[PDB]
Amino acid sequence: QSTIALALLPLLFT
Amino acid sequence: VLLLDVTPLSLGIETMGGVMTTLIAKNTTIPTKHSQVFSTAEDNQSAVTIHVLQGERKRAADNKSLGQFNLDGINPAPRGMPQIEVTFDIDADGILHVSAKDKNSGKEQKITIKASSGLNEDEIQKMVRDAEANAEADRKFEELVQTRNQGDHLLHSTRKQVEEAGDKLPADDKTAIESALTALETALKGEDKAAIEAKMQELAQVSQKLMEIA
Structure with a gap:
């Protein structure tokens, strides 16, 4: 099990 | 069907x-x-x-x-x-x-x-x-694992920025940030959500000059 991490989706300033 | x-x-x-x-x-x-x-x-x-x-x-x-x-x-x-x-x-x-x-x-x-x-x-x-x-x-397992993962993320990204700042980072800041990194690193080993979150916040508080080098 080669560790797989979450990827933080980016948010815009509207 | x-x-x-x-x-x-x-x-x-x-x-x-x-x-x-x-x-x-x-x-x-x-x-x-x-x-x-x-x-x-x-x-x-x-x-x-x-x-x-x-x-x-x-x-x-x-x-x-x-x-x-x-x-x-x-x-x-x-x-x-x-x-x-x-x-x-x-x-x-x-x-x-x-x-x-x-x-x-x-x-x-x-x-x-x-x-x-x-x-x-x-x-x-x-x-x-x-x-x-x-x-x-x-739920308590999932929230603990996520809080550790988040501490881990801050720890790694802050270390990267120390490495990049090099000799430009003053000694007071370098000492305080390195010491705050060790404290969060120790917190991640525990089972206390609040303890990890406090060490995240204390690291963030002392790292502000770090980001001001860019």
Whole structure:
């Protein structure tokens, strides 16, 4: 099990 | 048709900390296609393991293992640069297609899991009851694992910025940040959400001059 991490989706300033 | 195929349990993969991340929510009618982007846990990591799970438990171990494969040949890069797109595709025949593609390199590996695989109709009921019974402990495990993962993320990114700032970082700041890093590093080993969050906040508080070097 080669560790797989979450990827933080980016948010815009509207 | 008289019937539609519906998922009785969440399907997804094992992520950092031995937690289940759901790709296909329970009560989904098939056909269905869902994808999420993951990345590496460490600088220079050359492979990731895609461990396919079925269940409603948060600990990967308490869920039903449907199979596993590696995506390897990830060229050396900073933690978080690789873009491992994991796609769960269930066709009309109820076959789960799992794909993992590094969208940076187009390198891809796959498995197929048969509609027959995973928990049976009794085990499905057993899995739903366990999830119900273990709901509180399961939530506390998931929230602890996520808080550690977040501390781990801050720790790594702050260290990167210290390395980059080099001799430009004054001594008072370098000493305070290095000492705050050790404190968070120690907190991550514990089981106290609030303790990790406080050490995250104290590191953030002393690191403000660090970001002002850019």
